[PDB]
RNA sequence: GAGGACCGAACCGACUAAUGUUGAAAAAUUAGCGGAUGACUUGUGGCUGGGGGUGAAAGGCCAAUCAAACCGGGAGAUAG
RNA sequence: CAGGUGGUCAGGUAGAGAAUACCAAGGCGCUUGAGAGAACUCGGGUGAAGGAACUAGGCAAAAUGGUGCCGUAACUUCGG
RNA sequence: UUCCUUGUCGGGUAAGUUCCGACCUGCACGAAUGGCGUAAUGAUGGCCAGGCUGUCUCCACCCGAGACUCAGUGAAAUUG
RNA sequence: GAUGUCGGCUCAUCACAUCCUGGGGCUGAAGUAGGUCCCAAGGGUAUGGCUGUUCGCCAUUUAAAGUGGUACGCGAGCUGGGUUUAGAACGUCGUGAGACAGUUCGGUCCCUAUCUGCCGUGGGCGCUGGAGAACUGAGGGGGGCUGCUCCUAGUACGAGAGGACCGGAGUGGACGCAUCACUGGUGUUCGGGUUGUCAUGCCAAUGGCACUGCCCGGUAGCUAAAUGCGGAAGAGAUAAGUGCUGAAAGCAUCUAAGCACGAAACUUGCCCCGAGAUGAGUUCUCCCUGACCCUUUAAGGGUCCUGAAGGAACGUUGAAGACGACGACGUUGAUAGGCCGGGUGUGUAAGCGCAGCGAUGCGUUGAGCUAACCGGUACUAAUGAACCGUGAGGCUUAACCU
């Protein structure tokens, strides 16, 4: 039985998806896009947006449980100094999941993922 | 639910005295032995906390006569008439599990001092 | 007597004063409005339809929109029916609250229980698990034999093996009333009832003693 | 809540200091026996000069348990060891004299009122 | 286990009776490019609901 | 500083259990197990040939082959 | 093709160690994936109270496990 | 090694066709196809005790690999 | 040209020549307790020691520890102790090779289920216009056990000892169902402690790996040992049996006419499934009221227009689930995630300050973090559509209306 329990197995030991979650997570802050499976992509958003939450107050507890997630100082230096304040205004839901075609190896269902604000100015930097 | 827990704020004590693991308290419950009822003490050290708002409980373990003894009161019934601490001990678990294993000079608990 | 439905909200415990926790299971209990009436003459039986709760206009459809529209009342999350004693009279659009329970002492409560999915026999029937070591070949939570050699040839209708298990109708029988509180549409009744939080149950005054 | 083959302390002081529990009396395929319920033991150990000898085969009350009792208000009284008080085979009265060892309320009735007269703690 | 007949074409027709693939039913026209597409999927040139979301 | 000495890796072995049994494998894997300076183990080369060899002996082994190897021949043996 | 295959080389931390754990140099992720999170099977983890009642049998599992010091029985071929 | 046989007696257990001690009535022991003892040794046989435990009372939950669904590839025994 | 052989385990099912419980007759039946026979198969019907054992003996229970059939039920379900290969030994027999239901130690148990069957769960079509619901209940299945104490009453009975029927109340055992409020288990998705090592430049702080490294706690969920409930009462017809009236047969006679009792069996009553019940039922509601041509002229074919009720699909999903199915929801929106608040768990984070030679301690601080929970919140994702489904629904007769 499954009744009322989250949080999707994926195939994988309990280190190995945490271990994926965390590298799929720095690999969405850094291009701001991805593509992935449908499922991997539905429990990235558990995963990143409280990333971004915890980036909204800028501490050095913050940066460092933020490091503990993510164990990338490029990761977290792009969280507090660009998402933190890109997200300021906005509750929750900073990601958005467009399911595209199947993969042509597999059949897998993908989809994209990206961050909301990936607007035609994000080209500065 | 909204439901339910306008239900069991309207039984739950108002008065029960804060108290952590580690400290001893004197609960005083009702005996009942047919038309008498008296109150019987029960002193002993606090190993467990339960908080459940009405379904709270705590644990309290006490050596009597020889014999190890642990009891759980659900903090909220009218049984337990009330509720006193003797000494506030001074643990770092929430859980004193251990004291289990420990006997007289083992089972002694630094005062929180406080 | 008729029955009600209701909504299981949890269980939780009533403390007395004597000091007794009684457990029980709170019955979200709304206004109960009939639909529809029917008599020996038209429906060859006498009985009432029920409904409760309420429902968004829009998930509503034409077929049953005309039903509720028939009797005057607002449409609810579903009908139920409910066999008439000798005697008792009501009629369509009449609403009936929890406190007819008022004087009922004991209940029986009818509702859907939790599905287990598809279940082994070891959970299923309470077989006996085989021996986990001595030798055990991949045989520990099988059902063993399920029949006898040529003479019957064949395996007897009705043998216990494995399949769904729970998602059924289930009836609970003679629970006491501990509480009716009309003012909060609320019913307690002592001990467990089939069914989710959330669930739609049957309430009946006990059949039985 | 025990079983055959159980190993009980004894809280009297009819001799015995180890027994084990050979049957649960009072049903067919009864499993278990809580504090109130009979008992029929074997003594595994006794001092040497009591009333009882190792080997007898008596009856026994359970006294106290690990798996505790329950109280109508939800409590629970859980003991460190079982222990139990043996009882004359045919009579079910007491053998020994003293009760040590605190036991509870579960035996307040005609039948045991002189092990609850002895006991040194009721809970 | 094995079969002591042969089992016909006919059963083995039977048994594939539920083997029919089912097509997709209706492909949507997206607002803007009037491309059609996988309802809910985002279109070929990378449009969906009428947005074009990526740029490839 | 003796030992067919002790504990224990490599190495050699194969006691138990599970798995596997149209196997990953025509004898293995996994976890434990025995010996581990010796009647030890291993490489390279050599010798012993079928009623013969070799055998700390189980009729064991002698190219996935053994109460008489394999290949060709007598040979289309004979078959109430 | 989870087997077999002689010899040489032998870094760091911990360690008695060529055991073991984590790493260096260096080399790899084992040529189907993607989901789901039923029974059941396999390999594991934990378990109230009881503790061999299991069973042909404590099979399996659990447990014990190091160093120093104290201390150590019958029996003995005087070594154990 | 004993058929009768679970011989009889004692010990161990609440209860012991096994075990240990004895008796001698050795169906059918017996002295280098050795007799009787025997410290040490044994992946040897039998039995007992402590510890330990999901072996069991009586199973529960959990973590993984399959099973199940989708895409690709694609067997087998058997068969009037 | 193979039908695997004892016992055990698991899972059973039937018979009745009945072990218990139920109903009776007789008794050398005072009572209690028995003996024996008749009726009765609804349910129930031990755990251990020894032995491969079936059995048996023994210990201790129980209302009772029934007897049999089912390939001495059950190895394409398990086991492999025994029996029945190859090794070895003893006694014994034989000159010997060897042999012995004599003994002893050791000794590979294969099969991915086509069909029948069975447990579940769908698809198709049918049920005569289509659709959405609610039912009826033909029929089927489940369930059916019992102890002890108390009152009646120390009464009836009995010299005494002892000790009831009938009736009532309470409380258990075993079994079943449901549930998670409590007590607990689990909780590799929560928090903390800690060993070794590697890394993040280093300190500090963290992360990786070592069975989740080892551990201590623990949310939701699942769950039992946890706690609720169940077995009935009643009714009908009876079995054995007991009768009333009553002839045949002046009497007698329970029977021949007639009438009354009578059991856990039977039929109901309780629970569940159930209209594919093709004998395809009933009730309520909803939807559709266009043309035209052809032909062999009919339950005919075709074109144009039209596309309803509803359904399906897709998406977000669920205490629903192997997949289908089932349920909720799809901006007129709380379906999921996030977010906010709370709760819960863990137990006083980090940083800084202070004390100390230092390990560390103290203050800030019940701090920080917190999964599945609760209450909110459209921030993200659930799209305008498209698709399927049509256009008043045969014939005959009868009663009604025209």
Same mark, same amino acid.
């Given at each position: 039985?499954?009744?009322?329990?989250?949080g999707?197995?994926?195939?994988?030991?309990?280190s190995?998806?945490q271990?994926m979650?965390?590298?799929?997570?720095?690999?969405?802050?850094?291009?701001?896009?991805?593509?992935?499976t449908?499922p991997?992509?539905?429990?990235?958003?558990?995963?990143?947006?409280?990333?971004?939450?915890?980036?909204?107050?800028?501490?050095?507890?913050?940066?460092?449980?933020?490091?503990?997630?993510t164990?990338?100082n490029?990761?977290v230096?792009?969280?507090?100094?660009?998402?933190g304040?890109?997200?300021?205004?906005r509750?929750?839901?900073?990601?958005?999941?467009?399911?595209?075609?199947?993969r042509?190896?597999?059949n897998?269902?993908?989809?994209?993922?990206?961050?909301?604000?990936?607007?035609?100015?994000?080209?500065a930097? | 639910?909204?439901?339910?827990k306008?239900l069991?704020?309207?039984?739950?004590?108002?008065?029960v005295?804060?108290?952590?693991?580690?400290?001893?308290?004197?609960?005083?419950?009702?005996?009942?032995?047919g038309?008498?009822?008296?109150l019987?003490?029960?002193?002993?050290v606090?190993?467990?906390?339960?908080?459940?708002?009405?379904?709270?409980?705590?644990?309290?373990?006490?050596?009597?006569?020889?014999?190890?003894?642990?009891?759980?009161?659900?903090?909220?019934?009218?049984?337990?008439?009330?509720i006193?601490?003797?000494?506030?001990?001074?643990?770092?678990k929430?859980?004193?599990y251990?004291?289990?294993?420990?006997?007289?000079?083992a089972?002694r608990?630094?005062?929180?001092?406080? | 007597?008729?029955?009600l439905?209701?909504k299981?909200?949890?269980?939780? !415990?009533?403390?007395?004063?004597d000091?007794?926790?009684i457990?029980?299971?709170?019955?979200?209990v709304?206004?109960?409005?009939?639909?529809?009436?029917?008599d020996?003459?038209?429906?060859?039986? &006498?009985?009432?339809?029920?409904?409760?709760?309420?429902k968004?206009?829009? !998930?509503?459809?034409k077929?049953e929109?005309?039903?509720?529209?028939?009797?005057?009342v607002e449409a609810?999350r =579903?009908?139920?029916?409910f !066999?008439?004693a000798? =005697?008792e009279?009501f009629?369509?659009?009449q609403?009936?609250?929890?406190?007819?329970?008022?004087?009922?002492?004991?209940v029986?409560?009818?509702?859907?229980?939790?599905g287990?999915?598809?279940?082994?026999?070891?959970? !299923?029937?309470?077989?006996?698990?085989?021996?986990?070591?001595?030798?055990?070949?991949?045989?520990?939570r099988?059902? =063993?034999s399920?029949?006898?050699?040529?003479?019957?040839?064949?395996?007897?209708?009705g043998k216990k093996?494995?399949?769904?298990?729970?998602?059924?109708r289930?009836?609970?029988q003679?629970?006491?009333?501990? &509480?009716?509180?009309?003012?909060?549409?609320?019913?307690?009744?002592? =001990?467990?009832?089939?069914?989710a939080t959330?669930?739609?149950?049957?309430?009946?005054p006990?059949?039985?003693? | 809540?025990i079983?055959?083959?159980?190993?009980?302390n004894?809280?009297?002081?009819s001799?015995?200091?180890?027994?084990?529990?050979?049957?649960?009396?009072?049903?067919?395929?009864?499993?278990?026996?809580?504090?109130?319920?009979?008992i029929?033991?074997?003594?595994?150990?006794?001092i040497?000069?009591?009333?009882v000898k190792?080997?007898?085969?008596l009856?026994?009350?359970?006294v106290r348990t690990?798996?505790?009792?329950?109280?109508?208000?939800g409590?629970v009284?859980?003991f460190?060891g079982?222990?139990?008080?043996?009882?004359?085979?045919?009579?079910?009265?007491?053998?020994?004299?003293?009760?040590?060892?605190?036991?509870?309320?579960?035996?307040?009735?005609?039948k045991?009122?002189?092990?609850?007269?002895?006991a040194?703690?009721?809970? | 286990?094995?079969?002591?007949?042969?089992?016909?074409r006919?059963?083995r027709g039977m048994?594939r009776?539920?083997?029919?693939?089912?097509?997709?039913?209706?492909?949507?026209?997206?607002?803007?490019?009037?491309?059609?597409?996988?309802?809910?999927?985002?279109?070929?040139?990378?449009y969906?609901?009428?947005?074009?979301?990526?740029?490839?």
């Open positions: 039985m499954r009744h009322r329990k989250s999707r197995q994926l195939n994988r030991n309990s190995h998806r271990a979650f965390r590298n799929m997570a720095g690999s969405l802050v850094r291009h701001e896009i991805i593509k992935t449908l991997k992509a539905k429990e990235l958003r558990r995963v990143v947006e409280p990333l971004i939450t915890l980036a909204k107050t800028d501490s050095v507890a913050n940066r460092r449980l933020a490091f503990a997630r164990r990338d490029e990761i230096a792009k969280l507090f100094n660009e998402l304040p890109r997200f300021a205004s509750a929750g839901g900073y990601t958005r999941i467009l399911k595209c075609g199947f042509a190896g597999d897998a269902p993908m989809a994209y993922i990206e961050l909301v604000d990936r607007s035609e100015k994000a080209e930097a | 639910s909204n439901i339910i306008q069991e704020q309207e039984q739950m004590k108002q008065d005295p804060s108290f952590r693991p580690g400290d001893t308290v004197e609960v005083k419950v009702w005996v009942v032995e038309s008498k009822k008296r019987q003490a029960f002193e002993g606090v190993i467990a906390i339960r908080n459940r708002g009405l379904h709270s409980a705590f644990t309290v373990r006490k050596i009597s006569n020889g014999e190890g003894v642990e009891r759980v009161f659900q903090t909220h019934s009218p049984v337990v008439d009330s006193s601490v003797k000494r506030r001990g001074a643990v770092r929430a859980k004193l251990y004291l289990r294993e420990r006997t007289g000079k089972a608990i630094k005062e929180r001092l406080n | 007597m008729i029955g439905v209701g299981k909200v949890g269980m939780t !415990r009533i403390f007395t004063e000091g007794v926790s457990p029980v299971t709170v019955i979200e709304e206004a109960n409005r009939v639909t529809q009436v029917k020996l003459a038209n429906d060859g039986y &006498r009985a009432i339809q029920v409904t409760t709760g309420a968004k206009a829009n !998930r509503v459809t077929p929109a005309g039903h509720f529209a028939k009797a005057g609810g =579903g009908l139920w029916e !066999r008439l000798e =005697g009279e009629t369509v659009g609403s009936i609250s929890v406190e007819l329970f008022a004087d009922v002492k004991k029986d409560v009818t509702g859907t229980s939790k287990k999915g598809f279940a082994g026999t070891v959970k !299923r029937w309470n077989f006996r698990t085989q021996d986990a070591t001595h030798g055990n070949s991949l045989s520990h099988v059902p =063993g399920i029949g006898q050699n040529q003479t019957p040839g064949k395996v007897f209708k093996m494995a399949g769904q298990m729970g998602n059924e289930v009836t609970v003679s629970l006491d009333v501990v &509480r009716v509180d009309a003012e909060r549409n609320l019913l307690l009744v002592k =001990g467990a009832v089939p069914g959330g669930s739609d149950l049957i309430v009946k006990a059949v039985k003693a | 809540m079983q055959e083959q159980t190993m009980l004894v809280a009297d002081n001799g015995a200091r180890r027994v084990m529990c050979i049957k649960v009396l009072g049903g067919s395929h009864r499993r278990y026996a809580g504090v109130g319920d009979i029929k033991i074997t003594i595994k150990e006794a040497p000069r009591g009333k190792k080997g007898d085969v009856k026994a009350v359970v690990k798996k505790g009792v329950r109280r109508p208000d409590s009284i859980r460190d079982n222990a139990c008080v043996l009882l004359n085979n045919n009579s079910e009265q007491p053998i020994g004299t003293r009760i040590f060892g605190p036991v509870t309320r579960e035996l307040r009735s005609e045991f009122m002189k092990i609850i007269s002895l040194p703690e009721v809970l | 286990a094995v079969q002591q007949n042969k089992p016909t006919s059963k048994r009776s539920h083997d029919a693939l089912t097509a997709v039913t209706s492909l949507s026209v997206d607002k803007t490019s009037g491309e059609k597409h996988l309802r809910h999927h985002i279109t070929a040139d990378g969906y609901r009428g947005r074009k979301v990526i740029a490839k």
